[PDB]
Design a protein around this ligand. Structure first.
Ligand SMILES: *[C@@H]1O[C@H](CO)[C@@H](O[C@@H]2O[C@H](CO)[C@@H](O)[C@H](O)[C@H]2NC(C)=O)[C@H](O)[C@H]1NC(C)=O
Ligand SMILES: *[C@@H]1O[C@H](CO)[C@@H](O[C@@H]2O[C@H](CO)[C@@H](O)[C@H](O)[C@H]2NC(C)=O)[C@H](O)[C@H]1NC(C)=O
Ligand SMILES: CC(=O)N[C@@H]1[C@@H](O)[C@H](O)[C@@H](CO)O[C@H]1O
Ligand SMILES: CC(=O)N[C@@H]1[C@@H](O)[C@H](O)[C@@H](CO)O[C@H]1O
Ligand SMILES: *[C@@H]1O[C@H](CO)[C@@H](O)[C@H](O)[C@H]1NC(C)=O
Ligand SMILES: OC[C@H]1NC[C@@H](O)[C@H]1O
Ligand SMILES: [Ca+2]
Length: 640
């Protein structure tokens, strides 16, 4: 009936912010080659204050060269003695975020590590000091090369932690003058990190935040006992339709109400990766067409705004938050300066299902809510009102509510799937740019000669690495092939996912059925080396080992194979070929209906080879194992 909002008996927990994840893996891959002004507009919708999502927190993957869900991300240390702080796009993303919002909170976390750290094993805790050294170098580089202060460092995403590692990382940070950097652990479940902190005083002193993944709005007793800040350091991960926006809306409120969590961070920031990769379109918005410029400002963007535009890190929750009598919830926050924000959600079960977990049915029906301000809140007599309805009307501002009659009280009629924000703040704004170009398929004719002398990014556009890492490469010794694309991993990473045994980068339109793919290739390893081109590649990311399609391989021992699968278990054709190492060859692969053919230097090597049909997928290039190889003058023609 009536809900008392008071602060006279004190406040609840400090609010730490709302944010999102870029990474785990290659989720921002397709954003970097958006043309202007669209790329800038997209970043504004995400990071610009008082405009769109206005995010408080940005969390990025610390690339380790392994596959980490929708691709691989490059590391700052590919090999021992290698350091480079200009690979990939997370540096760039963090800088764009800081330009728009200097107060944004930055976090780094590893998913995978380069193999050389394991010293023969695939384990990051063999040499604690070395792994900490690797991680701390990343934090230093962010400062020295991009003027970025990293606020939080994590351990190993959804993977076991090592208590001695966490202690060494703290020791190492301090040694490098990074006392300011805080540690969050362990980006997995509540246990065993929570009990470990109660049993080990030394561990407790070095962990600042307990971050848990997909907690279902609840926490556990040991985490409450620790007295640490508790965050949902990864949540959401749901398609950004209205139902994903509902999920996001409900948990933003109820993570604090049910679980004492004072921050929630969504995976992922923006869907800039091919939709047919795992968890397609699971970002706060969509930008998966840099060639057309088309992007979609999805419902979750405005759901966020209901909290982010009217709260800041350092505000406090009121003690008086809770559930509504007939479904839904409410939270309230102040800044200690006279401001008050009230956020109300009535998301129904049918329209707010998250993928993890799925909630047992709960009823939500029409109701009346009376709110009464007490304590310092009593003198408030004016409140701005923002409204959203999911089904649809987004972040529309309504008429001001006045509490002039001295009752410090007001009443709202609530229905299902609504959000209300009531605040004393006048700065709210539904940001708006003109509509972007219409959606268009990947170009049916496409070419890249990789001839860029000073590239803005370390990899050519639209190539999404799914195992291994491909980079622009300048070779001054060669005139015809001075500027190529090169696979630079020479050993299997300490993996997060099940990376393939072969490296591979995919590109184009997953709908493609008929295609001709051409590329110049160069095998660097004598006798044992091999490369391939392919089409109809149907799976990537987490499932990259599963990929079928048509694969045209050549090897430096003088042979070729044609396979249905990346793993090379199923043969379509095979034979001998005039192929050696350290020599440029032109491969062509044509696939039409039931049949395929392959050319070596413009001459037929095999043709009319039966392949599975119907079938569809991307084009791709790659190498037999983790080995150096170069690629040049890529072209693809295809019918969708
Ligand atoms: C964590 O939040 C929970 C809410 O889920 C708090 O537990 C109590 O909640 C009930 C109603 O759910 C209130 O009537 C109690 O007053 C709350 N407890 C106290 C001590 O006030 C709990 O307080 C929170 N825990 C911490 C450590 O902040
Ligand atoms: C609500 O918040 C605003 C913004 O934080 C407060 O306004 C600021 O007040 C400080 C001093 O208290 C000034 O230094 C800033 O320049 C002000 N900024 C703006 C944008 O006005 C305001 O005092 C808070 N309280 C109320 C009742 O509005
Ligand atoms: C999109 C497209 O081109 N589809 C065609 C299909 O109609 C045809 O049956 C097949 C055999 O030629 O080749 C492919
Ligand atoms: C193997 C196959 O699909 N062949 C088809 C053929 O039957 C059809 O007449 C033509 C027109 O689209 O496309 C091709
Ligand atoms: C939900 O609640 C309303 C009002 O109490 C009731 O009429 C309706 O039958 C309920 N539905 C379910 C599925 O419980
Ligand atoms: O829900 C899937 C997400 N969890 C970890 C992140 O990398 C994604 O795989
Ligand atoms: Ca070239």
């Amino acid at each position: 009936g009536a809900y008392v909002l008071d602060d006279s008996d004190g406040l609840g927990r400090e609010f730490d912010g709302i944010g999102a994840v870029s990474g785990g893996g290659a989720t921002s891959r397709l954003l970097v080659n958006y043309p202007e002004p669209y790329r800038s507009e997209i970043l504004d919708y995400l990071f610009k204050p008082n405009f769109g999502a206005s995010l408080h927190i940005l969390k990025v993957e610390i690339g380790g060269d392994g596959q980490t869900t929708d691709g691989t991300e490059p590391s700052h240390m590919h090999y021992e003695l290698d350091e480079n702080y200009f690979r990939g796009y997370e540096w760039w993303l963090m800088k764009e975020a800081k330009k728009r919002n200097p107060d944004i909170i930055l976090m780094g976390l590893p998913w995978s590590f380069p193999g050389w750290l394991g010293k023969g094993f695939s384990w990051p805790y063999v040499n604690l000091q070395l792994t900490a050294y690797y991680v701390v170098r990343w934090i230093l580089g962010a400062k020295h090369y991009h003027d970025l202060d990293i606020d939080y460092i994590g351990i190993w995403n959804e993977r076991p932690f090592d208590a001695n590692y966490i202690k060494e990382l703290r020791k190492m940070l301090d040694y490098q003058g990074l006392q300011r950097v805080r540690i969050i652990a362990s980006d997995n479940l509540w246990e065993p990190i929570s009990s470990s902190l109660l049993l080990d005083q030394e561990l407790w002193k070095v962990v600042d935040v307990i971050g848990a993944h997909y907690p279902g709005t609840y926490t556990v007793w040991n985490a409450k006992m620790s007295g640490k800040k508790l965050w949902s350091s990864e949540d959401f991960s749901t398609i950004n339709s209205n139902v994903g926006a509902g999920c996001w809306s409900r948990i933003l409120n109820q993570n604090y109400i049910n679980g004492n969590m004072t921050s929630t961070i969504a995976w992922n920031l923006v869907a800039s990766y091919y939709e047919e990769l795992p968890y397609g379109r699971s970002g706060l918005m969509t930008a998966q067409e840099p060639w057309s410029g088309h992007y979609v400002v999805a419902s979750p963007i405005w759901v966020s705004a209901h909290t982010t535009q009217f709260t800041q890190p350092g505000w406090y929750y009121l003690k008086t938050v809770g559930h509504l009598e007939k479904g839904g919830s409410y939270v309230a926050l102040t800044d200690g300066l006279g401001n008050l924000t009230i956020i109300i959600e009535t998301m129904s079960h049918q329209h707010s299902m998250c993928i993890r977990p799925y909630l047992p049915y709960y009823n939500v029906s029409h109701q009346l809510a009376t709110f009464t301000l007490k304590g310092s809140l009593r003198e408030i007599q004016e409140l701005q009102v923002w409204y959203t309805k999911l089904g649809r009307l987004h972040f529309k501002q309504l008429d001001t509510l006045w509490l002039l009659d001295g009752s410090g009280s007001f009443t709202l009629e609530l229905e299902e799937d609504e959000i209300f924000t009531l605040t004393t703040l006048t700065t709210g704004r539904k940001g708006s740019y003109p509509p972007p170009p219409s959606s268009k398929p990947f170009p049916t004719n496409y070419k890249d000669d990789f001839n860029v002398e000073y590239p803005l990014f370390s990899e050519a556009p639209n190539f999404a690495d799914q195992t291994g890492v491909f980079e622009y490469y300048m070779n001054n010794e060669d005139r015809e092939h001075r500027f190529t694309l090169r696979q630079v991993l020479n050993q299997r990473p300490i993996t997060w996912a099940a990376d393939a045994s072969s490296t591979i980068s995919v590109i184009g339109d997953h709908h493609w059925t008929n295609m001709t793919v051409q590329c110049d290739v160069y095998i660097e390893t004598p006798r044992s080396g091999g490369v391939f081109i392919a089409g109809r590649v149907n799976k990537g990311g987490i499932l990259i080992r599963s990929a079928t399609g048509v694969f045209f391989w050549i090897f430096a021992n003088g042979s070729y194979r044609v396979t249905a699968d990346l793993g090379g278990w199923i043969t379509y054709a095979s034979g001998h070929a005039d192929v050696t190492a350290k020599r440029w060859y032109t491969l062509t692969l044509g696939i039409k209906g039931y049949f395929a053919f392959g050319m070596l230097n413009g001459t037929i090597l095999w043709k009319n080879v039966r392949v599975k049909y119907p079938g569809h997928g991307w084009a791709a290039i790659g190498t037999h194992t983790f080995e150096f190889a170069q690629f040049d003058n890529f072209r693809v023609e295809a019918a969708r």
